[PDB]
Amino acid sequence: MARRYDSRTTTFSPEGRLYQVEYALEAINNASITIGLITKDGVILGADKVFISKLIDKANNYEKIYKIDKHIFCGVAGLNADANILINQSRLYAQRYLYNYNEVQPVSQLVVQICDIKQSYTQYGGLRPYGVSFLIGGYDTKDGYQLYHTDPSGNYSGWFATAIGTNNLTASSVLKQEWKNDMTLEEGLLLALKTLAKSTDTEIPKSEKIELAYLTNKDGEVYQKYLTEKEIEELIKLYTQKY
Template identity: 60%
Template sequence: MSRRYDSRTTIFSPEGRLYQVEYAMEAIGNAGSAIGILSKDGVVLIGEKKVTSKLLQTSTSTEKMYKIDDHVACAVAGIMSDANILINTARVQAQRYTYAYQEPMPVEQLVQSLCDTKQGYTQFGGLRPFGVSFLFAGWDKNYGFQLYMSDPSGNYSGWKAAAIGANNQAAQSMLKQDYKDDITREEAIQLALKVLSKTMDSTSLTSDKLELAEVVLSPSGNVKYQVRSPESLSKLLVKSGLTQPAAEAS
C-alpha cells in the first residue's frame, strides 16, 4: 500500500506518515552503533567502526567521530557522504557565529540551525532526506556540558544518555537501567563500553573496532576535544574485563 505514497518526500500517507523519512531512519538502523553519555565532568561519545583494515591510517582518519568547533563534536550513524555535507555546514555556521559575535556559538543554537537544514530536505520535492543521525556533545557557558540527538526528520532533543544506529533500542534500555545522574566521566566510559559490547554486531570488542571521544574542560577552563588512541582503548577494555584473552595476548 505504501508504494502509492513513498515516491515523494512531500506526499503524506492516509495515516499522516512520510515514508521517505522513515526509510532514511531505517538506513540508520543498519549503521554502526554510537552511544553518547553525559557526565558531571564531560561528555563521552563511543562508536562502532564498520571499516576495519590493517592498511587504514587510524591516526589521520575517523569513521564515527568529528570535531565541529573547539567546544562541539559529534558522533555519526548512517550514510557517511551525507554526514560529511552536514558536518561541513555545521562548521561553517559555527565559524560565522564566532566571526560575528567574537564568542563560541551556543551548542543548542548550532544543533537547531543544522536541524533546520535537515528538515528542509523533507519538505521540498526533488530532494531526499539526509540518511544520517547525530549525537552532538559540547559545552557552553549557558548550560555547561550538553548532549543532543538528531534524526533525518530534523527533530532534535537533549539527552543524558542516548544511542543511535544498529540495536539502538536495546542500548537505550540498558542505558536507562544503569545511568546515574552523578556519573563521572570514567564511569560513563565504562558504561558505554559495557553497553556497546552487548549490542554491537561483532562477537568480540577490540580497540580497532571502536572510536572513543570526549569533550572535557581543561584545568585552565578551556573546552577540550580528545580522541582516545588504540593503545588507550586497549587498556580500557582490559580494565573493563571486555577483551578476549587472544586480544590481550597480542
C-alpha cells in the same frame, strides 16, 4: 512529461507520514551503533567501527566521530557522505556565529540550525532527505554540558545518555539501568565500553572496532580527546578487571 519520473519525496502519505523520511530512518537504524552520555567531567561519545578490511589505515582515522568546533563534536549514524555534507555545514555555522557575535555558538543553537537544514530538505523542493542522524555533544557556559540527538526529519531532542544505530534498544536498556547523574570520566568511559559490547553482542571489546572520544571543560578551556588504540586498550583492560 517529466512528471512521470518524479517520486514526490516531499509529499504526505495517507497516514500523515513521509515515506522518504521513514526509509532514511530505516537506513540509520541499519547503520552501526553510536552511543553518547554525559558525566560530571564531560560528554563521552563512542561508536562501533564497521569492519571493511585490515588494509584500512586505522591510525589517525576517525570516521564516526567528528569535531564541529573547539566546544562541539558529533557522532554519526547513517550515510557517511550525507554526514560529511552536514558536518561541513555545521562547522560553517559555528564559525559564522563566532564571526557575527565574537563568541562561541551555543550547542542548542548549532543543533537548531543543522536540524533546520534537514527540515527544509524534507519540506521544500523535490530532493531526497539526508540519511543521517547525529549525536551532537558539546559544552557552553549557558547550559553546561549538552547532548542532543537529531534525526532526518529535523527533529531533535536533548538527552543525558542515548544510543542510535543498529541494536540501539540494547544500548538504551544498558544505559538506562547503569547511567548515574554524577559519574566520573573513567566511570563513564567504562559504561560506554560496556554498552558498546552489549550492542555488538560480545564480552571482551576489541580496540580495533571501537571509537571513543570525550569533550571536557578543564582549566577554563574545552578540550576534546579522541582516544587512540593504546588508550582504548588500557581502558579495556580496566573494564576487564572490573567485569
